[PDB]
Amino acid sequence: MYFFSVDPRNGASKSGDVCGSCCCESISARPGEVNGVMVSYAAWSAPLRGHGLTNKTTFEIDGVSVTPPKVSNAFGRTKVGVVFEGTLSDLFPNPEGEQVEYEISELNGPSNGVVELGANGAFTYTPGALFTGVDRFWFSINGNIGEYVISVDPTTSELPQPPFTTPVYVPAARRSVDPRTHVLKFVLGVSPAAIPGDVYRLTVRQVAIDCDGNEFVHISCYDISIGSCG
Amino acid sequence: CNKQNGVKNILITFTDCDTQEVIGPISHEQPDDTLPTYKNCAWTNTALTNGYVQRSASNATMTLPVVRDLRVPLAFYQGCAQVDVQVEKFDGTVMTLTEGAVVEPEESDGRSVTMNIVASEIDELLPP
């Protein structure tokens, strides 16, 4: 669990501005992990004697070094109870001539089904009986990692399309704030397809509140460094 | 005011002058009520005649009694190891010393040594 103490935006910080520094904080992450981050706004919100923070936090993800992926992702659809078939060769546009070692990691496999990988870029997915939702599984074509999404329908018409989860993301609703101790908690999820060495930037906009209901904004920045083996 | 005289923390770092291996910084404990002594000015004076004085160069010294730590060999206190010491009193003062050299070793009994450190300059931090 990461723990950060926020700039109090008082004065001493960065000798006023003379210094400046304020280089965004560091967050080391590993592809596949799902960690938790806490930030203590006390040093900034304690002098502002009022009703602490509010549940109006905002996040943003932008990549400063991305290394676009080699293998593309894919989406498929099927009904409940009926077995699904698919190929795994048309997802790897190879510029050079080489061999394709298809693989499905047992760690990041499906959740409500079973997949049998074919001998030549094929796969058979039997979904879990008496189930209707979405399913994902992560393939490793020649080392390059990608995800395959399957939508099982409740046999009636159709299910919508999920948004193909990003390398780094923050869960939709898993954030919280304790107005008693001025602490904001959230989760940081790293997809198994994030390439080591890439660097993303996360900016957090948190709003406090005075004694009468007005607002006080604060913005902070962190660099998520996608590294391998820790 | 002037809160009680006395020492609070004593830090020592040993560096063997042959293999250049470093140990510390380790703390220590006073063996009795006496306190370490100091001399900061690197220029002693000598009484000339008719009020004048000869200002020559000299060394900043420090005398410090400590209880031997049972994991550091006694030779490291007797002057076979370069030492860096730091003392902090109750009133807030701190006295730091780097590249010290234990000079004039005195016979000890194995549990309480009195080191006569000599260094180029001792630095203060007069309390707030």
Partner: protein, 171 residues
């Protein structure tokens, strides 16, 4: 706290003795003399601890001259009143009231509280002696501490004047 280089009894009893043993519900009573009354100071329920000054004295130089580092030494004592509890051993066995009482845990954790306080504020005390003595179903555990300090001139007032312009007649 008042007296930046010292700790008056009440402060001793409420900050060093109280956060120690929780079996005395904060009944660390500051008294004038530990034997000022034995008929009144034996009504508070067991257990409880008294704190009282024995005698105030000096530590060398003591003249009162505005600048002589007036040194002082306050000798106080801390008396535990702990209820002795006999051990019963079904078969008609018991332990008499004169059996040994473990004061060691008491001394240990009292010293620990004193050490933590000294580390928190830079104030140290001297241990002098420990006496225990019982009476009926009570054991008296008597520590005698002694505290050195320097008394500060408080007057610390405003100056007589502010100098500047003088006068001169070099006739």
């Amino acid at each position: 706290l008042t007296y930046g280089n010292r700790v008056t009894l009440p402060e001793f009893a409420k900050y060093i003795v109280a956060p120690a043993f929780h079996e005395i519900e904060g009944r660390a009573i500051p008294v004038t003399g530990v034997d000022d009354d034995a008929s009144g100071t034996q009504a508070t329920k067991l257990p409880f601890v008294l704190v009282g000054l024995r005698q105030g004295d000096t530590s060398g130089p003591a003249t009162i001259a505005g600048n002589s580092t007036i040194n002082l030494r306050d000798d106080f004592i801390v008396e535990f009143n702990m209820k002795k509890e006999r051990y019963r051993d079904r078969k008609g066995g018991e332990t008499p009231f004169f059996s040994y009482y473990d004061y060691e845990s008491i001394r240990d954790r009292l010293f620990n509280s004193m050490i933590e306080f000294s580390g928190e504020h830079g104030i140290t005390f001297e241990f002098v002696s420990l006496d225990i003595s019982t009476e009926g179903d009570v054991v008296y555990i008597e520590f005698r501490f002694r505290q050195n300090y320097e008394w500060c001139e408080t007057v610390r007032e405003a100056d007589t004047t502010i100098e500047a312009g003088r006068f001169s007649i070099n006739l």
